[PDB]
Amino acid sequence: NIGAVLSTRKHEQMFREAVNQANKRIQLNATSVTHKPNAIQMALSVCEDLISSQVYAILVSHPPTPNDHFTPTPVSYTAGFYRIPVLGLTTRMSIYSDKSIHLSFLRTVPPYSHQSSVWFEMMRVYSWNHIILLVSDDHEGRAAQKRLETLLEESKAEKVLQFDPGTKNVTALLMEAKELEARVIILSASEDDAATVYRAAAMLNMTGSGYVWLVGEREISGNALRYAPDGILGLQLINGKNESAHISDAVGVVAQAVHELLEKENITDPPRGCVGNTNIWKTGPLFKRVLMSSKYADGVTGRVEFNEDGDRKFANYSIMNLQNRKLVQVGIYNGTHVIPNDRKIIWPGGETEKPRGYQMSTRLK
Amino acid sequence: SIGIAVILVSDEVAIKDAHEKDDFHHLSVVPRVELVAMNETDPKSIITRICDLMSDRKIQGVVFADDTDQEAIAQILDFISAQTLTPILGIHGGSSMIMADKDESSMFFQFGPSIEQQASVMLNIMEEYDWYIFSIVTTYFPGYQDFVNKIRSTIENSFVGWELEDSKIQNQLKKLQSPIILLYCTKEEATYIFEVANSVGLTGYGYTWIVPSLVAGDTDTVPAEFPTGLISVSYDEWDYGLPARVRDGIAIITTAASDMLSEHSFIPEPKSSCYNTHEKQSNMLNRYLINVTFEGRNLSFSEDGYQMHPKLVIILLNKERKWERVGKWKDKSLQMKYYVWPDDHLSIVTLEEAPFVIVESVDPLSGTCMRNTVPCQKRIVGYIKKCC
Amino acid sequence: KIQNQLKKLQSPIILLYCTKEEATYIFEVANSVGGY
Amino acid sequence: LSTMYRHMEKHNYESAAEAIQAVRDNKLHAFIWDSAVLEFEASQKCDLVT
Amino acid sequence: TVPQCCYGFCIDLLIKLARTMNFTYEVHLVADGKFGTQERKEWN
Ligand SMILES: *[C@@H]1O[C@H](CO)[C@@H](O)[C@H](O)[C@H]1NC(C)=O
Ligand SMILES: *[C@@H]1O[C@H](CO)[C@@H](O)[C@H](O)[C@H]1NC(C)=O
Structure with missing residues (x-):
């Protein structure tokens, strides 16, 4: 309904193509497109663009900055200040869903706090027992640990649950894990923290000695793989690698929501100027409810089903095993079920069979 | 020293006079005097005012005040700290309210109690009322x-x-029918929640609901269908004036700056008046600004945005769209003039008569009594009720 | 009024005898309120 | 038993040995809820009755 | 933490159970000496 917002020229072209496709198939009006590389400047730039567009429609993607921590935060705050629901493309961050501070900051790609159901299904299929989970000191790690604990309540095991802020010298967690004698561990943190954990595990001579575990999608990066050993069963998004596909789905969802809301006669007029925005939007909750209720049968991302918090229940993730410093996609789990037997999983130790989680536990205090 | 300013969206002209009259015996460098006046509710106007203040002089911290009920503006103020690495103070209105899980690297100070403080106040009120919840019901809300x-x-x-225990919500309310009900939902959801409670019957004189700040932020236009008997917790709704809050914030900022200068020997200053001026030394002052003492009262606070001695007030909604301002929370102490709250009311005279009434002492740990006794309003020779 | 009385008396057994047209509203109210 | 717990809690002992030593000097009225050690104190010491 | 001697009914029962189950144990006392309680969500 408003002008498209994108970071790069290719993203702008993709957004324009998606808008044209939506208009070809209740009309989207656009006047100009603008963006800023600085978050502080972008906070005012997005407000100015929304004011000039005379419409409430904001949908941006994540910047290519390596940090990817607080660059889109001011834009999200500006979008959530009013009653203007927004949709994020290729924005997999669990910080937004950890506290739900924003009004309707919904992303098609599930955040890092999700995918614990896939881990639970894998553990049930492989009958894994006596596993521990390490969560980063950030809010995203705490939320992921809480979700995993909630989904593991039939039991689980005595997880270390170390804070792990990301210090250079961190050996207490490794010592505790060795003492607990847990074959399967679940670690999810930042790239630097994951690299430090892998280095500590390698220095302990226990990374590939009868210990086979799995890792999340947060640490899936080239830098982490350069130091991590083989035999790691990481997770990857089904279609989150490229953002050129989610833009079409977002445009279609926005068009469907606009068509659904056009029936209602309580449509408000956004202010022409940003300064003259004393009035508070009141139809925003209704639009958010309509968007949550509305769903797409198919598309680039397939079936989309918003959860209670507003997260798409795609439940699709590809499991990649590490062998000879190479990633092999041995099937993919869709709908939180078993994955196809594309390739045989090989443990880092060298045994084809999955080692038992509760093994080598005789002495007790 | 500090180029703080007060923005009123209301005159508050006495704040500058109070700040000037404040002594600087313990202050190393006298602060700069600057005031910014604007009437807007947009991020662009706030950004322009901040840029103008930074260009005029070194702010190193600003105080924001507002008259609207939009608390999210305070959250934007937190982002302002992320754009300046400087503390942001609140006086009244949106800035007074404290957001949920708003703690981060950027420093932010608010005069409103957090979720934990509100829960503690509600627990103290329930202990005073000698009632128990015995019912868990929470709507889908961020807090x-x-x-x-x-x-x-x-x-x-x-x-x-403590005891622990539209069709779906009505059934849940009926199953968990308790005299004490705790709820937290938005006003739009509360409109249907009140109707559901009235239909079920908990809205009558058989149960009471507690909504501290979720809906009853300002109970001046309460709906007619809203049941009477519920109470709410506010942060100096009609007790602390805006100029007094501004003066207290200025004094706290000056004391924090003095402490930081004493502990670091180098007062930080903004690089320039640009958006990315400080994009290139900020936690040192934040680590000492938490322990702030001013006006003969320590204002120590944590990252959650609480108060060491909050001025919490309790408002009791009535059937005539009126709320009682009686209630104080000085020095984290519980006291009120309506502790005994409700031809169903009777008075019974009771004597000692040895074994029939042998309890004559009240536990001083929290001012309450046991779970198998009753209050006893003894004579003045006022209303100091003991345990019977 | 009727809903409050129905919710107050949450007995497993409820007896009612009236016209079907009037009984329909009572049954709807009881179902909305809510084993028994 | 709420009235028998809060009103009579400040006189509790953190260890059974301290309670036994106190009661051996007639400095304690009675001690209960320690049958594991009371089945031996009343037998070996034979100085108190249960 | 001087190593003291642990013997009696409970120690004998634990030793017999370990011998029957072929388990290795390291018995030790508790510095606090409390029997266990739930003080201020965590067992202290
Ligand atoms: C810190 O010191 C060295 C440096 O890595 C390391 O070997 C050691 O285990 C660390 N100790 C602790 C307690 O972190
Ligand atoms: C604050 O600092 C003063 C002295 O600088 C000290 O006496 C006081 O204990 C401190 N308070 C806290 C809470 O750290």
Whole structure:
């Protein structure tokens, strides 16, 4: 309904193509497109663009900055200040869903706090027992640990649950894990923290000695793989690698929501100027409810089903095993079920069979 | 020293006079005097005012005040700290309210109690009322897990044990029918929640609901269908004036700056008046600004945005769209003039008569009594009720 | 009024005898309120 | 038993040995809820009755 | 933490159970000496 917002020229072209496709198939009006590389400047730039567009429609993607921590935060705050629901493309961050501070900051790609159901299904299929989970000191790690604990309540095991802020010298967690004698561990943190954990595990001579575990999608990066050993069963998004596909789905969802809301006669007029925005939007909750209720049968991302918090229940993730410093996609789990037997999983130790989680536990205090 | 300013969206002309009249015996460098006046509710105007203040002089911290009920503006103020690495102070209105899980690297100070403080106040009120919740009902809201965790921690720490227990919500309310009900939802959801409660019957004189700040932020235009008897917790709704709050904030900022200068020997200053001026030394002053003492009262606070001695008030909604301002929370102490709250009212005279009434002492640990006794309004030779 | 009385008396057994047209509203109210 | 717990809690002992030593000097009225050690104190010491 | 001697009914029962189950144990006392309680969500 408003002008498209994108970071790069290719993203702008993709957004324009998606808008044209939506208009070809209740009309989207656009006047100009603008963006800023600085978050502080972008906070005012997005407000100015929304004011000039005379419409409430904001949908941006994540910047290519390596940090990817607080660059889109001011834009999200500006979008959530009013009653203007927004949709994020290729924005997999669990910080937004950890506290739900924003009004309707919904992303098609599930955040890092999700995918614990896939881990639970894998553990049930492989009958894994006596596993521990390490969560980063950030809010995203705490939320992921809480979700995993909630989904593991039939039991689980005595997880270390170390804070792990990301210090250079961190050996207490490794010592505790060795003492607990847990074959399967679940670690999810930042790239630097994951690299430090892998280095500590390698220095302990226990990374590939009868210990086979799995890792999340947060640490899936080239830098982490350069130091991590083989035999790691990481997770990857089904279609989150490229953002050129989610833009079409977002445009279609926005068009469907606009068509659904056009029936209602309580449509408000956004202010022409940003300064003259004393009035508070009141139809925003209704639009958010309509968007949550509305769903797409198919598309680039397939079936989309918003959860209670507003997260798409795609439940699709590809499991990649590490062998000879190479990633092999041995099937993919869709709908939180078993994955196809594309390739045989090989443990880092060298045994084809999955080692038992509760093994080598005789002495007790 | 500090180029703080007060923005009123209301005149507050006495704030500058109070700040100037404040002594600087313990202050190393006298602060700069600057005031910014604007009437807008947009991020662009706030950004322009901040840029103008930074260009005029070194702010190193600003105080924001507002008259609207939009608390989210305070959250934007937190982002302002992320754009300046400087503390932001609140006086009244949106800035007074404290957001949920707003703690981050950027420093932010608010005069409103957090979720944990509100839960503690509600628990103290329920202990004074000698009633128990015995019913768990929480709607889908961002401030849900924190409130439940705080309530669980409070009931676990407390020596006295606590009982634990449109069609779906009505059935849940009927199954969990209790005289004390805790709820947290938005006003739009509260409109249907009140109707559901009235239909079920908990809105009558058989149960009471507690909505501290979720809906009853300002109970001046309460709906007619809203049941009478509910109470709310506010942060100096009609007790602390805006100029007084501004003066207290200025004094706290000056004391924090003096402490930082004493502990670091180098007062930080903004690089320039640009958006990315400080994009290139900020935690040193934040680590000392938390322990701030001014006006003969320590204002120590944590990253959650609480108060060491909050001026919490209790408003009791009535059937005539009126709320009682009686209630104080000085020095984290519980006291009120309506402790005994409700031809169903009777007065019974009771004497000692040895074994029939042998209890004559009240536990001073919290001012309450046991779970198998009653209050006894003894004579003045005022209303100091003991345990019977 | 009727809903409050129905919710107050949450007995497993409820007896009612009236005209079907009037009984329909009572049954709808009881179902909305809510084993028994 | 709420009235028998809060009102009579400040006199508790953190260890059974301290309670036994206190009661051996007639400094304690009675001690209960320790049958594991009371089945031996009343037998070996034969100085108190249960 | 001087190593003291642990013997009696409970120690003998634990030793017999360990011998029957072929388990290795390291018995030790508790510095606090409390029997266990739930003080202020965590067992202290
Ligand atoms: C810190 O010191 C060295 C440096 O890595 C390391 O070997 C050691 O285990 C660390 N100790 C602790 C307690 O972190
Ligand atoms: C604050 O600092 C003063 C002295 O600088 C000290 O006496 C006081 O204990 C401190 N308070 C806190 C809470 O750290």
